[PDB]
């Protein structure tokens, strides 16, 4: 276990964040729950220059 696991729940996930193609979630609610934290990462390229 390492790639197959909900970033929010903490058990298992079958969906993947099409935005960064890195996040995983089992339900629309799961992605929103961690969204607050995940969104800081999602999109790649940290907000620094311009």
């Amino acid at each position: 276990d390492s790639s197959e696991s909900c970033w929010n729940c903490g058990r298992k996930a079958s969906e993947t964040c099409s935005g960064c193609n890195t996040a995983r979630y089992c339900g629309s609610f799961c992605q929103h729950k961690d969204w607050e934290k995940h969104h800081h990462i999602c999109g790649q390229t940290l907000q620094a220059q311009q």
Binding site: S14, E15, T16, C17, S18, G19, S28, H32, W35, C42
Partner: peptide
Amino acid sequence: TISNPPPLISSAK
């Protein structure tokens, strides 16, 4: 209270 994140992609083989 946050924007709307991109859509989710379900994978399965």
